[PDB]
């Protein structure tokens, strides 16, 4: 039965009991219900009026905090002689919540989630520290971040005609500004995102287990807009995500063992307890040993 709850529950005064056919401390765990025994039935209580609030454990408050989701560093310079794998004054990132463990464990407390996502972008710069360079001051560069849908075409170079952004949303911002900010709506083809997915998202037998591309929000494509200077710099970009307007379903057992990979739930555990595969809690000498026992002298 649903009700509105703003504070913790009050306690009522209680008397001696001695009554045949009545046993409120006995229960049947096999049914799958939790024990309904109340304090007034177990001991003699006083009256207490309880004013403790419950708002800091609301689901919106628990999940709606900006958390780090990407950190990328790259060199801002003339890239004429760089190797094929290098980020040449720009990079691509696929938006995900799988890479930094504090946000990942919190989202994985639930089976399905529906939210809008507030995105904040923070940029910092430093002079390259090779022995040819003195310090010189730091440039106030312009950057472009372009939103591109999951699987769509992305730019191939810093000066590509793809950056013309004729229908894609782009945000232009300077290092001297406050951090850039925008909101992405709930974009799923379904009524909620799947946090876990027990299946194969293709009609043939061959691909990966447990990844549904309908839960991938999109891509950010990021460049420096300025031409290269005569000297090199290192630029670092950090992205933060805050979920808002949240609904959540079907709570789950928390992650115990360390994460191995962004792609799956694979496990190994620590070498010794705590959080080892064969022992989650740290050991004590026996079930009769009290570990922080008070000594009086």
């Amino acid at each position: 039965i649903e009700s509105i709850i703003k504070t913790a529950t009050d306690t009522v005064k209680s008397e001696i009991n001695a009554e045949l056919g009545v046993v409120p401390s006995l229960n049947a765990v096999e049914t799958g219900a939790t024990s309904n025994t109340e304090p007034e039935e177990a001991i003699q209580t006083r009256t207490v009026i309880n004013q403790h609030g419950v708002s800091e454990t609301l689901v919106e408050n628990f999940l709606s905090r900006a958390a780090l989701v990407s950190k990328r560093s790259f060199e801002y310079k003339d890239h004429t002689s760089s190797a094929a794998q290098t980020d040449k004054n720009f990079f691509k990132w696929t938006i995900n919540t799988r890479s930094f463990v504090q946000l990942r464990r919190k989202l994985e407390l639930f089976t399905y989630l529906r939210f809008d996502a507030e995105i904040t972008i923070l940029t910092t710069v430093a002079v390259n520290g090779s022995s040819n360079n003195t310090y010189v001051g730091l440039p106030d560069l312009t950057l472009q971040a372009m939103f591109v849908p999951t699987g769509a075409l992305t730019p191939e170079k810093q000066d590509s005609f793809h950056w013309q952004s004729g229908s894609n949303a782009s945000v232009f911002f300077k290092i001297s500004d406050p951090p850039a900010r925008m909101t992405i709506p709930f974009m799923c083809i379904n009524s909620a995102y799947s946090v876990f997915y027990d299946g194969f998202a293709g009609f043939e037998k061959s691909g990966l287990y447990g990844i549904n591309p309908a839960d991938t929000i999109g891509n950010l494509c990021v460049r420096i807009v300025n031409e290269h200077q005569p000297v090199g710099f290192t630029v670092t970009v950090r992205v933060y995500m805050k979920p808002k307007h949240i609904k959540a379903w079907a709570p789950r057992p928390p992650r115990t063992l360390p994460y191995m990979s962004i792609a799956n739930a694979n496990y190994k555990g620590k070498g010794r307890a705590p959080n080892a595969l064969n022992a989650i809690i740290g050991n004590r000498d026996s079930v009769k040993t009290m570990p922080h026992n008070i000594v009086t002298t």
């Binding site: 009700s3 509105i4 709850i5 703003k6 708002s55 919106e60 709606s64 307007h245 949240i246």
Partner: peptide
């Protein structure tokens, strides 16, 4: 609360639903 944007999903967070029902997890029996 200040919001001058045209799309409702732009708004600030929603911290005011105090409704609960523990019994769907604590008492799921006939």
């Amino acid at each position: 609360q200040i919001n001058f944007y045209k799309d409702s999903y732009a708004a600030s967070a929603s911290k005011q639903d105090f409704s609960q029902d523990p019994s769907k997890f604590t008492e799921p029996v006939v």
